[PDB]
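Re-running the complex after MR caught last week's input typo. The corrected sequence lines follow. Everything else is unchanged.
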Amino acid sequence: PPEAEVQIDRLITGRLQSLQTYVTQQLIRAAEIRASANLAATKMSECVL
Amino acid sequence: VYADSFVIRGDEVRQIAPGQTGKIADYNYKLPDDFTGCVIAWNSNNLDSK
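Corrected-run output:
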C-alpha cells in the first residue's frame, strides 16, 4: 500500500497536469473562436441587414 | 494517548511499523497505514526467561 500510494500519486499528478493543459488550451481556442464569432455576427448584422 | 504494549521476538520488531508486512504484522498487531505515534523496543530477556 505505501509504494502503491506513491506511484498512484505520481500518476495522479501526471494526469492532473495533462487535464490542466487540455483545459487551458481549450480556453485559449474558445477565446479565439469567440472573437471569430463576434466578427461573424457583426458582419452579418452590418451586411445582410 | 494510547499505550498498547506487548512482548515479541527480536526478528519481528520491524513488523511493528506502518506499511511493513509479515506474520505478526497482519495476524497479531496491525498498525494503521498513517501512524502518528512512537515505537519503542528494548531487550528484556532477564525479566521473563526461566
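None of the earlier attempt is carried over here. The two ends of chain A are 68 Å apart (CA to CA). Chain A touches chain B through two residues (CB under 8 Å).
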